[PDB]
């Protein structure tokens, strides 16, 4: 839908970032020239940042612009959502307004299943899904640590980290390893002063130019205008 | 919707069981003569059974047919669902068929909120709702114990306990006390041999005569035909 996975061998594969974007369970579609490049490059910076902090990620190296070399993992069938500020689907689950500052981070577990439209699950559903309580606890522990690292990093750059989605897999040693991507597609980012979205919500809710919004994030983090 | 709550004093109130039944977030409505009486009487038997087993319930005594004397509690805004067999909403959350025997009980937490249509929550939402992790853990621990007591009791009477909903409150000592009702309205009950519903699903999905189904449960448990 937004990425291709290309085999290399048993140990590694290629994650390719496409210009394609979707929303509303794949029902909204557009292409944005440069979006693959931006998301690829922002994922690299985030993976490298988190690695420095002791977070095991699938990130191995770059394979030219839009393609990353990543470790092969047994993927957990989860989307793991961390929420600091109330936005999107949390508005329908809690009677709190968009922009409400949570007293502590909220972690949500979603089962990756297209047929069931990615329903929310708890630790018990997880277990029936074959994911042990100890696996779940260390998945959440990692997500909360990632949260602290990303929110501090971004607050320096005048960016509020509202929420974001993570995915994980096990490597050959049975270690839990951070996977997929971290990009303006899979996070909400607000400008600290204006509270404007610099993320996929621009596309989701037609708030302006998606590529300008993504370029802003890139420029704020790197201090440079994008090469494409 | 199905019950009235009538004050007595600071310590206690009246729970009255009405003939009214609803389904599909209150959109389906009917009255069933005798349903209040059946649900009242079955709640009594269940509360008395669980009390014997060390479960603190709000049950104090009977006030004539359809009305129970119950303890006043600070109610948790939760519906706590325990699931042994796949049925109802769990079919949309897990790709398992109706009638699938779970490898262990599933506990689900729902936030009681009419505006939000009782959305599922996890421990983190609970906390933002003002419910501590320790409160949640002992709420679930009680629900799982209630489950074991009810499923064994009912298996003797040729009834499979598929799932059921519980509600809870704190008494003046800050003890967590089982509340609301336990009736064929708030449980799924299948016949052990035929797998037929003897519960509110009869009404929900027009499967036959609701009152016959409820009378069956009553007769199986008490060994007697209902006085009304
Ligand atoms: O479903 C709801 C209900 C309320 N609120 C919040 O809590 C306040 C409660 O006030 P009310 O529901 O009367 O709405 P208002 O009149 O403030 O718009 C609102 O301003 C909202 O910020 C919310 O976020 N979601
Ligand atoms: O959304 C789903 C998908 C599958 N299944 C179960 O897993 C089996 C998988 O087979 P399939 O999805 O091909 O359906 P079938 O062809 O068996 O009806 C089914 O029989 C169902 O019991 C389910 O319960 N829910
Ligand atoms: O399939 C999804 C669903 C959500 N999210 C991200 O997770 C957060 C919470 O999403 P929502 O549950 O509010 O839609 C947002 O940052 C959103 O972009 C994803 O990356 N992929
Ligand atoms: O508002 C509700 C919702 C569900 N249940 C009960 O909880 C179980 C699971 O319900 P569902 O989530 O499958 O609808 C069933 O026994 C159902 O009767 C209730 O008592 N009240």
Curated annotation (Swiss-Prot), chains A, B:
InterPro entries: SAICAR_synt/ADE2_N (IPR028923), SAICAR_synt_PurC (IPR033934), SAICAR_synth (IPR001636), SAICAR_synthetase (IPR050089), SAICAR_synthetase_CS (IPR018236)
Signal peptide: none
GO biological process: 'de novo' IMP biosynthetic process; cobalamin biosynthetic process
EC number(s) per entry: 6.3.2.6
Gene Ontology molecular function terms on file: ATP binding; phosphoribosylaminoimidazolesuccinocarboxamide synthase activity
Catalytic activity reported: 5-amino-1-(5-phospho-D-ribosyl)imidazole-4-carboxylate + L-aspartate + ATP = (2S)-2-[5-amino-1-(5-phospho-beta-D-ribosyl)imidazole-4-carboxamido]succinate + ADP + phosphate + 2 H(+)
HAMAP family reported in the protein's UniProt record: SAICAR_synth
Family the UniProt entry places it in: Belongs to the SAICAR synthetase family.
This protein's name: Phosphoribosylaminoimidazole-succinocarboxamide synthase
